[PDB]
Enzyme design. Structure first.
Site, PDB file in Angstrom:
ATOM      1  N   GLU A  83      41.679  19.916   8.093  1.00  0.00           N
ATOM      2  CA  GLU A  83      42.328  20.729   7.359  1.00  0.00           C
ATOM      3  C   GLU A  83      42.005  22.230   7.233  1.00  0.00           C
ATOM      4  O   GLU A  83      41.488  22.823   6.651  1.00  0.00           O
ATOM      5  CB  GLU A  83      42.157  20.499   5.649  1.00  0.00           C
ATOM      6  N   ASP A  84      42.530  22.813   8.704  1.00  0.00           N
ATOM      7  CA  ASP A  84      42.746  24.001   9.040  1.00  0.00           C
ATOM      8  C   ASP A  84      41.318  24.649   9.041  1.00  0.00           C
ATOM      9  O   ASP A  84      41.479  26.016   9.306  1.00  0.00           O
ATOM     10  CB  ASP A  84      43.684  24.957   8.053  1.00  0.00           C
ATOM     11  N   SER A  85      40.044  24.009   8.842  1.00  0.00           N
ATOM     12  CA  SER A  85      38.871  24.649   9.132  1.00  0.00           C
ATOM     13  C   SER A  85      38.656  24.569  10.773  1.00  0.00           C
ATOM     14  O   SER A  85      39.491  24.125  11.489  1.00  0.00           O
ATOM     15  CB  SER A  85      37.741  23.885   8.483  1.00  0.00           C
TER      16      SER A  85
END
Ligand code: ZN
Ligand code: ZN
Lengths: 56, 66, 49, 44
Positions: free
Chosen positions: C3-5
């Site tokens: 999730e976009d980390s």
């Protein structure tokens, strides 16, 4: 420098350096006896034309 | 803002080649490709920095200091 | 990275990747009310202010 | 060893209530003469 006022007492010369250079008025002058040697020294440094102006 | 040291990717000593690269590209008017190749940077990991570094320090030093 | 980390190399950070300066400044000056009852710039003593 | 201003960097060494303007030039900058002390920085 500031020339202190000179007062006379007996056979001595005293000066009052008010000096006031503090942000506050600081009324606190210094009463220092003018040691004759420094007077002689400063006299040794006077310009010759001053003597003529000073009548010497 | 001088050439950095120790490629972020690899860590090879980089920057000591800066003068060689600058002159080599200048008096020999070779492309960067052959320039870096003869410089000895086979991996592209090192290649990126020398390819895309701007020595701002020159524009800095123009100021009369103090 | 879920999730976009994302993940970045500690060693790269060590070698300098994405390092940044940071500048803050401050504003100050004297004040006037007279008849110059003004402030000062000096280390105040414990028994002063 | 107290004050320096722009482009005429001579030791101003002013103390207090002493004509903030530079003696040499008309500058009014007066950088504050980085400390003579010593500091510690980490290699990392
Ligand atoms: Zn590399
Ligand atoms: Zn000046």
């Amino acid at each position: 420098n500031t020339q202190p006022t000179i007062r006379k007492d007996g056979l001595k010369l005293v000066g009052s350096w008010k000096k006031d250079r503090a942000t506050g008025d600081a009324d606190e002058p210094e009463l220092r006896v003018l040691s004759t040697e420094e007077i002689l020294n400063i006299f040794k440094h006077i310009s010759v034309k001053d003597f003529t102006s000073l009548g010497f | 803002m001088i050439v950095p040291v120790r490629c972020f990717s690899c860590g090879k000593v980089v920057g000591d080649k800066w003068e060689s690269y600058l002159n080599l590209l200048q008096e020999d008017e070779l492309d960067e490709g052959t320039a870096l190749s003869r410089l000895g940077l086979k991996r592209y990991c090192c290649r990126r920095m020398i390819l895309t570094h701007v020595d701002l320090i020159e524009k800095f030093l123009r100021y009369n200091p103090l | 990275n879920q999730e976009d980390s994302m993940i970045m190399n500690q060693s790269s950070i060590d070698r300098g990747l994405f390092r940044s300066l940071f500048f803050r400044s401050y504003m100050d000056q004297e004040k006037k009310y007279g008849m110059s009852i003004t402030e000062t710039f000096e280390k105040p003593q414990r028994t002063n202010t | 060893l107290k004050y320096i201003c722009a482009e005429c960097s001579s030791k101003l060494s002013l103390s207090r209530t002493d004509a903030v303007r530079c003696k040499d030039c008309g500058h009014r900058i007066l950088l504050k003469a980085r400390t003579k002390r010593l500091v510690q920085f980490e290699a990392r």
